[PDB]
């Protein structure tokens, strides 16, 4: 409890919880920052931690969070993370809308993230702002494995089946809110809501660029056989502009 912990110094807890209490700090010699997402006996009321762990440890991506370490005992896992101090969430809000530039720049590294997701066959399926954060470079992390406003309709459902085609349209919902700083489908009305993601039923902006409206276009397609794939995003004229090259 105890402000140092074999290569990290606690500096203070941001937060707290059930078996919750997560702290900050940061590598002794490296100076890295993280957080300390600390586990225990608690847990008793498991499946879905083993998950990340196996997850975040088998995905080493410059737009993935990493995970350091996982320090086990007989009471706690705690896990060592990547710290990344802001979300994608609060750089859409309080900036105004954002040049076409500046979203292909973050889009094209989610879309990276999530390609290397679906190779090693995990699916996302709760991809938003504010489970995509923002280091101090400007870097999109993706951080997790609130809104219902970039589920896809085999998601708000329950009845099919969420495969990777359900990444993409968050992706879709993500682009356009960058794009627009307005969400496709927002309504107050929680079913008018799920009633018009379900229909796909959303407006293109007149003033979205024609590579851009058809991307998007085809991100919120609600038969997923007929919406883009990962790789067919890929290889899309609009997208590939100013790719860089480790992002291939």
């Not at 105890?2 to 941001?14: D, E, F, P, R, S």
């Not at 040049?99 to 590294?109: C, D, G, I, N, T």
């Not at 992706?171 to 018009?196: A, T, W």
Request: hydrophobic share 40%; glycine share 6%.
């Amino acid at each position: 409890d105890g402000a140092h912990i074999g290569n990290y110094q606690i500096v203070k807890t941001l937060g707290e919880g059930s078996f919750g209490k997560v702290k900050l700090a940061y590598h002794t010699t490296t100076g890295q920052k993280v957080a300390l997402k600390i586990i225990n006996k608690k847990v008793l009321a498991q499946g879905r931690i083993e998950r990340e762990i196996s997850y975040l440890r088998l995905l080493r991506h410059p737009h993935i969070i990493k995970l350091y370490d996982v320090i086990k005992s007989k009471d706690e896992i705690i896990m060592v993370i990547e710290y990344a101090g802001n979300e994608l969430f609060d750089y859409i809000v309080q900036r105004d809308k954002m040049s076409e530039q500046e979203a292909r720049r973050f889009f094209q590294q989610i879309i990276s993230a999530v390609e290397y997701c679906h190779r090693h066959k995990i699916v996302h399926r709760d991809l938003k702002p504010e489970n995509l954060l923002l280091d101090e470079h400007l870097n999109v992390k993706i951080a997790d494995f609130g809104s219902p406003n970039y589920a896809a309709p085999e998601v708000i459902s329950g009845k099919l089946y969420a495969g990777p085609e359900v990444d993409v349209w968050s992706c879709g919902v993500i682009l356009y809110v960058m794009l627009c700083r307005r969400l496709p489908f927002d309504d107050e009305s929680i079913p008018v809501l799920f009633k018009n993601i379900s229909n796909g039923v959303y407006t293109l902006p007149k003033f979205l660029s024609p590579g851009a409206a058809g991307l998007i276009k085809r991100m919120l397609i609600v038969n997923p056989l007929n919406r883009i794939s990962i790789h067919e995003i890929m290889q899309d004229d609009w997208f590939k502009v100013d790719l860089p090259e480790y992002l291939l």
